[PDB]
Amino acid sequence: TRPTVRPRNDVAHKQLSAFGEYVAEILPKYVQQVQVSCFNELEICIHPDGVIPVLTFLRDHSNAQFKSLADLTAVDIPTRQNRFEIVYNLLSLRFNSRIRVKTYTDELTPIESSVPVYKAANWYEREIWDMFGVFFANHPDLRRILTDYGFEGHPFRKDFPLSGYVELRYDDEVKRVVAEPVELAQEFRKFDLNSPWEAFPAYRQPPE
Amino acid sequence: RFIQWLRNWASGRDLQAKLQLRYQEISKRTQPPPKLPVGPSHKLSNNYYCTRDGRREAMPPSIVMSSSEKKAVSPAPPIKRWELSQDEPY
Amino acid sequence: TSVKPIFSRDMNEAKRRVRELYRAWYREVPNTVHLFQLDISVKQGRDKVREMFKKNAHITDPRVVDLLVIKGKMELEETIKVWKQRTHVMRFFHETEAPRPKDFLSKFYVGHDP
Amino acid sequence: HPAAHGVLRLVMELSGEMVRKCDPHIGLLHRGTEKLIEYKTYLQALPYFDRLDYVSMMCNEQAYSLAVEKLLNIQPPPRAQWIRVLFGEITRLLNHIMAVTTHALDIGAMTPFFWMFEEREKMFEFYERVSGARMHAAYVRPGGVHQDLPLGLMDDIYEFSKNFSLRIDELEEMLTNNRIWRNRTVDIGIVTAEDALNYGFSGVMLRGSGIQWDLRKTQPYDVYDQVEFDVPIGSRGDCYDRYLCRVEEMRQSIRIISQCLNKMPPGEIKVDDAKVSPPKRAEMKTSMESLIHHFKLYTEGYQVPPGATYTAIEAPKGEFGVYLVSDGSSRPYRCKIKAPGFAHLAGLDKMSKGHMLADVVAIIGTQDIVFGEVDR
Amino acid sequence: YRKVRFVGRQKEVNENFAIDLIAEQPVSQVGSRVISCDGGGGALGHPRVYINLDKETKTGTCGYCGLQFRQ
Amino acid sequence: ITVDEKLDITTITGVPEEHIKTRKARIFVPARNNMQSGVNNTKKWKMEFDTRERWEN
Amino acid sequence: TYKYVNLREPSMDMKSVTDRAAQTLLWTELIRGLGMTLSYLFREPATINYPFEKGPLSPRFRGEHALRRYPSGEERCIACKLCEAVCPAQAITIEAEPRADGSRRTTRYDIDMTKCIYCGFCQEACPVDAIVEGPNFEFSTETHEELLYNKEKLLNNGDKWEAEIAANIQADYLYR
Amino acid sequence: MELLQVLKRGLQQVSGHGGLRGYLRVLFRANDVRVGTLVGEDKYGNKYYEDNKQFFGRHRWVIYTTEMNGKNTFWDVDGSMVPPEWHRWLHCMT
Amino acid sequence: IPHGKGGRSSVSGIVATVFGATGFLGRYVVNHLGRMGSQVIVPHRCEPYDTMHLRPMGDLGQIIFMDWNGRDKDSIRRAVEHSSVVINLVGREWETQNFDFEDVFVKIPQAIAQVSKEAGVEKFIHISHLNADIKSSSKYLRSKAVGEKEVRETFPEATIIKPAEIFGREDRFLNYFANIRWFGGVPLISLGKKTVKQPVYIVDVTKGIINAIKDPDARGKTFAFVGPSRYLLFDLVQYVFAVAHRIGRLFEISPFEPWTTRDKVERIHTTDKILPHLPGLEDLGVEATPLELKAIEVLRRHRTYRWLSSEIEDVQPAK
Amino acid sequence: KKTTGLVGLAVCETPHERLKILYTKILDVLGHIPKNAAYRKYTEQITNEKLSMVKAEPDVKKLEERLQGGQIEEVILQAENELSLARKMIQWKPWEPLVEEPPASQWKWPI
Amino acid sequence: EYVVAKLDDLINWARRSSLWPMTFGLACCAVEMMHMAAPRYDMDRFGVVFRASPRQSDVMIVAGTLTNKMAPALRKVYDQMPEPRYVVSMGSCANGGGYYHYSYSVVRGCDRIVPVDIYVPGCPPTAEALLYGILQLQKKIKREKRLRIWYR
Numbered sequence A: 001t002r003p004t005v006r007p008r009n010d011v012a013h014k015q016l017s018a019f020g021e022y023v024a025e026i027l028p029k030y031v032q033q034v035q036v037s038c039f040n041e042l043e044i045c046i047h048p049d050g051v052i053p054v055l056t057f058l059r060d061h062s063n064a065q066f067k068s069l070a071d072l073t074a075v076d077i078p079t080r081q082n083r084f085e086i087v088y089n090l091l092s093l094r095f096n097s098r099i100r101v102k103t104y105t106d107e108l109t110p111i112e113s114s115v116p117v118y119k120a121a122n123w124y125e126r127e128i129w130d131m132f133g134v135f136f137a138n139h140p141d142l143r144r145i146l147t148d149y150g151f152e153g154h155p156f157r158k159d160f161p162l163s164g165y166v167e168l169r170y171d172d173e174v175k176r177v178v179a180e181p182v183e184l185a186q187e188f189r190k191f192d193l194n195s196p197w198e199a200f201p202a203y204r205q206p207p208e
Numbered sequence B: 001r002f003i004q005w006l007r008n009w010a011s012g013r014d015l016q017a018k019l020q021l022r023y024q025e026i027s028k029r030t031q032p033p034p035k036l037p038v039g040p041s042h043k044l045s046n047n048y049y050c051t052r053d054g055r056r057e058a059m060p061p062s063i064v065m066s067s068s069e070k071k072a073v074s075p076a077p078p079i080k081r082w083e084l085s086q087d088e089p090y
Numbered sequence C: 001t002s003v004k005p006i007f008s009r010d011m012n013e014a015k016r017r018v019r020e021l022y023r024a025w026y027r028e029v030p031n032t033v034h035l036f037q038l039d040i041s042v043k044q045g046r047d048k049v050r051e052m053f054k055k056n057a058h059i060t061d062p063r064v065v066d067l068l069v070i071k072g073k074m075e076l077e078e079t080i081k082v083w084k085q086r087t088h089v090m091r092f093f094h095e096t097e098a099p100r101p102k103d104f105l106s107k108f109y110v111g112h113d114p
Numbered sequence D: 001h002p003a004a005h006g007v008l009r010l011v012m013e014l015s016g017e018m019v020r021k022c023d024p025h026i027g028l029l030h031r032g033t034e035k036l037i038e039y040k041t042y043l044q045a046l047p048y049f050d051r052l053d054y055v056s057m058m059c060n061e062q063a064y065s066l067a068v069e070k071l072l073n074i075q076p077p078p079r080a081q082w083i084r085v086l087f088g089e090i091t092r093l094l095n096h097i098m099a100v101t102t103h104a105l106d107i108g109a110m111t112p113f114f115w116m117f118e119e120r121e122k123m124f125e126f127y128e129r130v131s132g133a134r135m136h137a138a139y140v141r142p143g144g145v146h147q148d149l150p151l152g153l154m155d156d157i158y159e160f161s162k163n164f165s166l167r168i169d170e171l172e173e174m175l176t177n178n179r180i181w182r183n184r185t186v187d188i189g190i191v192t193a194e195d196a197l198n199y200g201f202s203g204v205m206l207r208g209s210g211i212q213w214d215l216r217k218t219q220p221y222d223v224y225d226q227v228e229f230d231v232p233i234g235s236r237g238d239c240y241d242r243y244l245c246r247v248e249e250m251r252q253s254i255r256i257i258s259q260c261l262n263k264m265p266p267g268e269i270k271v272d273d274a275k276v277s278p279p280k281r282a283e284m285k286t287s288m289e290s291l292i293h294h295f296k297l298y299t300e301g302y303q304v305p306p307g308a309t310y311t312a313i314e315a316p317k318g319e320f321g322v323y324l325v326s327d328g329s330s331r332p333y334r335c336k337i338k339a340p341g342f343a344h345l346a347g348l349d350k351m352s353k354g355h356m357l358a359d360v361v362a363i364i365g366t367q368d369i370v371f372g373e374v375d376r
Numbered sequence E: 001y002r003k004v005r006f007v008g009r010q011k012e013v014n015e016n017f018a019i020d021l022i023a024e025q026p027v028s029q030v031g032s033r034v035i036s037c038d039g040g041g042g043a044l045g046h047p048r049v050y051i052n053l054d055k056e057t058k059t060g061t062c063g064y065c066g067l068q069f070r071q
Numbered sequence F: 001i002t003v004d005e006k007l008d009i010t011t012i013t014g015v016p017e018e019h020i021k022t023r024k025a026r027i028f029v030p031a032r033n034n035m036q037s038g039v040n041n042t043k044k045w046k047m048e049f050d051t052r053e054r055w056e057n
Numbered sequence G: 001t002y003k004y005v006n007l008r009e010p011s012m013d014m015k016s017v018t019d020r021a022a023q024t025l026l027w028t029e030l031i032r033g034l035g036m037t038l039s040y041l042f043r044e045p046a047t048i049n050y051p052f053e054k055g056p057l058s059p060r061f062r063g064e065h066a067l068r069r070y071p072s073g074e075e076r077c078i079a080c081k082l083c084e085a086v087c088p089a090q091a092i093t094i095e096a097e098p099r100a101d102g103s104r105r106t107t108r109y110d111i112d113m114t115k116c117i118y119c120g121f122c123q124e125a126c127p128v129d130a131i132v133e134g135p136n137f138e139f140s141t142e143t144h145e146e147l148l149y150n151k152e153k154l155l156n157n158g159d160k161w162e163a164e165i166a167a168n169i170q171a172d173y174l175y176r
Numbered sequence H: 001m002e003l004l005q006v007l008k009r010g011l012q013q014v015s016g017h018g019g020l021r022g023y024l025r026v027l028f029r030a031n032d033v034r035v036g037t038l039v040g041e042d043k044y045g046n047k048y049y050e051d052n053k054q055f056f057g058r059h060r061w062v063i064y065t066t067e068m069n070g071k072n073t074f075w076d077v078d079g080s081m082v083p084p085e086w087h088r089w090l091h092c093m094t
Numbered sequence I: 001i002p003h004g005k006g007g008r009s010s011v012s013g014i015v016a017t018v019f020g021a022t023g024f025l026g027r028y029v030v031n032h033l034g035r036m037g038s039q040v041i042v043p044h045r046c047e048p049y050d051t052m053h054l055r056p057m058g059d060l061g062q063i064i065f066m067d068w069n070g071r072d073k074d075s076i077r078r079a080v081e082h083s084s085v086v087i088n089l090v091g092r093e094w095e096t097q098n099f100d101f102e103d104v105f106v107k108i109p110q111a112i113a114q115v116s117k118e119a120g121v122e123k124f125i126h127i128s129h130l131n132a133d134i135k136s137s138s139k140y141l142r143s144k145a146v147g148e149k150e151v152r153e154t155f156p157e158a159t160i161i162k163p164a165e166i167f168g169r170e171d172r173f174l175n176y177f178a179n180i181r182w183f184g185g186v187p188l189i190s191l192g193k194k195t196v197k198q199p200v201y202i203v204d205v206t207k208g209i210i211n212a213i214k215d216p217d218a219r220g221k222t223f224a225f226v227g228p229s230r231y232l233l234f235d236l237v238q239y240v241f242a243v244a245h246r247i248g249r250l251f252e253i254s255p256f257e258p259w260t261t262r263d264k265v266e267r268i269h270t271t272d273k274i275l276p277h278l279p280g281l282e283d284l285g286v287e288a289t290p291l292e293l294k295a296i297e298v299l300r301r302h303r304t305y306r307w308l309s310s311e312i313e314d315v316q317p318a319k
Numbered sequence J: 001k002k003t004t005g006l007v008g009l010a011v012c013e014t015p016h017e018r019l020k021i022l023y024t025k026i027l028d029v030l031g032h033i034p035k036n037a038a039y040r041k042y043t044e045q046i047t048n049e050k051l052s053m054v055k056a057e058p059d060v061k062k063l064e065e066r067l068q069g070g071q072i073e074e075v076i077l078q079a080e081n082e083l084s085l086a087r088k089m090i091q092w093k094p095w096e097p098l099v100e101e102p103p104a105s106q107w108k109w110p111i
Numbered sequence K: 001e002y003v004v005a006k007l008d009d010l011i012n013w014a015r016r017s018s019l020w021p022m023t024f025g026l027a028c029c030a031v032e033m034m035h036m037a038a039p040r041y042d043m044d045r046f047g048v049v050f051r052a053s054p055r056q057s058d059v060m061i062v063a064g065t066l067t068n069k070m071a072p073a074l075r076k077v078y079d080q081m082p083e084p085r086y087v088v089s090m091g092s093c094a095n096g097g098g099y100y101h102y103s104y105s106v107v108r109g110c111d112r113i114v115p116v117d118i119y120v121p122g123c124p125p126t127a128e129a130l131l132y133g134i135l136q137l138q139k140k141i142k143r144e145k146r147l148r149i150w151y152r
């Protein structure tokens, strides 16, 4: 359009269009939506039964290696009727390309863990257990990482209010370092910044 | 002096790139008042929004998803190898 | 209910699993009372455990009971070993915290409707 | 103590004299980071990426600003790219001074710590003259650099950077052909297989052992293609030849600085279209249209379109990735950080078995573990 | 009830006040219709605002400027 | 397989402390801060909780 | 591209082995190495003698807070509520009131000096150019009850100098 | 023969600066013993010397004297006694 | 007036003023007032450093420190001006080589029964002991009875407290025993006739006060603290060696802080179990603590692990 | 050569006939997958174009071009593990049609 | 008298002639302390030698940020220190916690665990306002142990 606006290219917008066309053509048991990101990236929606095989198809092949697990993460979403969102991410070292694996889930429904396929996701899966409560099945070592020994909230989800319940202190009443109910010395003001007029017309929701 | 060349028989010899810049060749200050221009389509009668449009670009274009002699095309052409950078590669 | 379970199937392997780990905790009360050098009476540590299991008996569903197992299974790693430095164990015994009124008229003198 | 100053409690069921089992405990500095960025705006939550490492200052915020420009469809202007390289390749002479000194202080050499930090204070001078402050500078923004650097810094970087290759010619005679330090570090912690890629490692503890790859000349950042340099590789797979990347990269960073002084175009700094950059102080004080975009760009933030993204730069020990889901309003949704220490330290339990206990303190220094970045 | 925190602490408080230090200004006169006040010097002080001075005759200290301004 | 169909009401417990029975939530549609006239602030059902004491420090 | 380091075999002949067997046995390294590189003590030490000498700084430095005022006083603040909306750490606490003359001012103004994360976001959000990060790191009080600042500390702390501050801002307002 | 080649400069430097009393009086506070080249003017009696441009960082040294506003004789120097004008000078800010 | 939860950082209405508050009895009181939260103005005599472990009790601006000699009037008339209650626990053991020890329990509780009384305070509280009797014992035990009598003239309603003998955590009473690793264990005086007293637990005496500090209507009604179950024997000294298995002083040592070859050997064995018509602890509810539960903790010598506790006492008789 | 580039691999030993065994080792397995899958339809195509370039031409270096694996020992390992994928590919059935559509509003991001 | 109060012109001078700091380098204020041991503003040999062991130290210096999982390990280490001990907190996170004052996993202030003497404010204080911090600590030592045993 002008300077200070990002120039795109149609090369990678056509190749990454054409490449992952046949990842839905040759495993149509699991893959249920594929969409191309406008900034030349790929997302591929996978039913949670296909957590191990579509990785295992990728893990070794001649046409799509994807041998580096960069980032396993997890997002929680109320109002979805299935809460969470597990997002895998991989790296084709032979090819310089990215693809993300977005598998939805719920709390009580377990997920078959990707420990045997990648040994990178040993610590990326003990962590998500602590922060949301997703129970990854048959994990070789499931423990308590990044939290204290007394938290029972799984705090990175939307039901845990920002400051905790267990604000700590010391007393000389015996020797110990003891807990207490939470007691702030300031309100933590909550500002309101969401301004009207619906500035974005392209992403507009259907009218209803 | 005798303490000068004793530093020249040991650990090479520099005498110019001393550690402290406390000696000369140290910059004192700067004089002038700075003036900074404003260039990229700041002016008028052509330079103009709705041609400048740094935002408002469409959603990610989805491909065929649910609800032919393809030659097994890779995501990209594979990485060609590198040189060995002739400065002193060994 | 179309979702696979964790360990149990229906009401019987679950309610023998919860009776299994109680025999672990009943054995591993009088060990930590000297393994941390904490000076109370040993019957206090057994009263807290038989208090704690009766709390959750309103469940009419499997794999919720199995979720509480995993928490109960995990604590025997830290407690039977030495990973809590005398202080994370003693938080179950609210010694410092003042007593709550829990009767109507004593709330009315102190506190705007807790 | 004397192992990251007061953190990293680890258990070692040592098999007689060898270790053969080692499982550390993190979470002694957790602070609640990713919970807390959900309650801020974009510009306001920027100085919690600067504190996410310790020692990289402008290398972080280089991978936050670049992960928000993608969502906005805005490129930075041309002078704003040759500033970011002159700093993003001067923090690679700070993260590599620390990894070659504090490693060699845990081992026990006294002076090259003191010999380099006496010289290092010529270079924390340069942050103060440009941004305003000592270490944590809130300088890079999602529309380029905040403000212009003063009259100077080109007769003072040039006096500095023409005399750094002698200071790096001292560590070669302290350490490389030294015998005792070579004996303390050869063939130790040889993890080299494709289990050293199945673990998902980023750079060095990769390329120092085999696989030649890095994201600076297989992907672009900036006007960063227009410089020329070579990427040092290692021969065998141990600590002494992933040490030698860090000595050799510091010589190659002088080449990318001396190539950067010649090329800076005069011009603007901020992104011009004013829905992202604030305007000048002499501009919001005469005209009318400038307050409405100075005021309202400080009560609420920008407005960024929805949709996820991911990126990666070459942080001077690994990567630094952001998975920044933005909903469509001034406060963002989840912001997941990828940093090293998840890869670089899950792969210690493989790396440590068979060797002594006094080999284990020799292992950890080469990964350049900086805590608060294990808060990924 | 509250005053015990500065027993032997000298209670350091402000000395000059600008609650009313406006009034010592020789309120400026022009003989015009509208005047600018980017008061305090250019590129510093409050932004430029145009005040109507026609009552019988004062301006109102610009809202920002504080200094009593008139004709 | 082992899909074990049944029906039992999903209720979870243990995570908060005592604020289950003490606090009644409130679901509402927010309605247009009337000093302006833009209607993007609507269109989302929210929830919000009770207010309690705020003394002075 | 590439570069290979530590990829070289030894010579392994009759000559150069004596060159290496003079190293291990009679120490042609480790004395020529570090009995000479260390001493080299004969440089002048660089120590700032702190109670008298002080170190260099720069005119954009960040530090203690202040509130300026105009020529003959007006308390340059106007309580426009922006320096409190972009503190990332929520330190500022402003409560205005219509003052009796008609121009609006503050009543209470509170800056914690512990939640202050030292951005420079108050310094640059202000339209009327009042609250300025002043260039003096003189601090170190002995009570947490003290580092909470009021309004009538900052003015006193902002009129202990303005010859210091106004020499700085006049040099540096031309960039921003 | 540098034992007298450069001590001849130091002989007038050490001895002939304030005699016998003016030398050890500054020696008992620190090893800051070099007489500076130039002088400052301000303010009380504390002539803030400025050196011969043969240093950097240690080229702007100050002296304190006695009891600014209720202090001891010489054995309490805290460093915050300076006037708020030398902050523009002592810190090399201009 | 109160507000909110009384966990920390609340207001709770009261503004105490606790004199002494450095020793074993005075310190442990202030800990329970640095919880419910209140302006506990604590003045101290001559100790800048020895009071430093008292500061993480008052939240932020709760407590405040002043210096005061005690004999001078206005140094104790400057802190008592803004107050609600004021309790007293000042005093010591043996006569010092500078003071006179006689009127220190007479004029000095009266020096803070001065214009302190006039200025508008209420609920002024003094302390007593269960053995302070005007019959001919002792130089310390009587002349405390002067403080029971000669200070009762002013403030005709106080609720002066009369606690029992205390065993605690950092005390001197029980700790005077088992510190007798020495050339012999000599009891007083090779007899077990009237041993033992009522060792009340120090958490109860500091819980009696804070239930009396807003009781209400407890003025003039003096109280006497019940001890444990129930009397005790000479078996105590055998019980101390059963589980044990055999501030601001100076720079190097204080050469005189002794074990007092004087009245102190018989300042504790004069028992005098006093009037059981005093109300005196259970009505100042609710607290009743034994000895055999809290006996493991404060007794601590070189075994440090192996206790194997089974030592007990029947009641003893006259229970 | 003695260095195989990537440390952890080894030059042992024979090129040009270690490969052509392992292609046709899989082609026997590749015939077994019940042919209506697109998996056979592509994987048969990628091995035949490979081996027609492979068998049988010097040098060792020329096989690296036109078949874009890495060095020759690693080109073995691209095909070595595709066998290990292939016998797993019979076990589960990717060629069968789709199972358990998500409940019609899950992949709609701006809420 | 003049005999006894003269003796605390030596002991209260011996106690301030050599402090031996423990430090808790936890977060970003560790590095901006290490530049003070770097020979520009050289910490040692202005009286105060650097880091030692927990049994031998006088005056500890808290830095960084105290979470929940470091709160007992601080107080245990504070116990082992001798009787003339002092606590300095540097950093703006041991003063009320920087930011992360509102997030769940931070002990909000580090005075809630130990009694701390000299507060030094600033995200990283510039090792220039920390020598001014410790030169406030030496000026704090004007106390005497004489006229305590000699008054009462």
Ligand SMILES: NC(=O)c1ccc[n+]([C@@H]2O[C@H](COP(=O)([O-])OP(=O)(O)OC[C@H]3O[C@@H](n4cnc5c(N)ncnc54)[C@H](OP(=O)(O)O)[C@@H]3O)[C@@H](O)[C@H]2O)c1
Pocket: I020, I021, I022, I023, I024, I025, I026, I027, I045, I046, I047, I069, I070, I089, I090, I091, I092, I093, I104, I127, I128, I129, I163, I164, I165, I166, I248, K152
């Ligand atoms: N109820 C009981 O069972 C019992 C048992 C024994 C003693 N007492 C007496 O009841 C109170 C309990 O005190 P305690 O157990 O904590 O022991 P304590 O050592 O007497 O502490 C009381 C405080 O009073 C201070 N003091 C002594 N003389 C003073 C004076 N002229 N002026 C100001 N302060 C003076 C003491 O030293 P400082 O001056 O340095 O502060 C001490 O800090 C004391 O009065 C004690 O004599 C009661």
Ligand code: SF4
Pocket: G076, G077, G078, G079, G080, G081, G082, G083, G084, G094, G125, G126, G127, G128, G129, G130, G131
């Ligand atoms: S300085 Fe500016 S932002 Fe701060 S109160 Fe005054 S007018 Fe408002």
Ligand code: SF4
Pocket: G083, G086, G087, G088, G089, G090, G091, G092, G111, G115, G116, G117, G118, G119, G120, G121, G122, G123
């Ligand atoms: S420096 Fe930053 S955090 Fe501190 S008061 Fe100013 S705006 Fe707020």
Ligand code: SF4
Pocket: D051, D136, K027, K028, K029, K030, K063, K064, K065, K091, K092, K093, K094, K098, K099, K122, K123, K124
């Ligand atoms: S807030 Fe201050 S103390 Fe905390 S990590 Fe950042 S710089 Fe260090």
Ligand SMILES: [Zn+2]
Pocket: E037, E038, E039, E046, E061, E062, E064, E065, E066
């Ligand atoms: Zn004006």
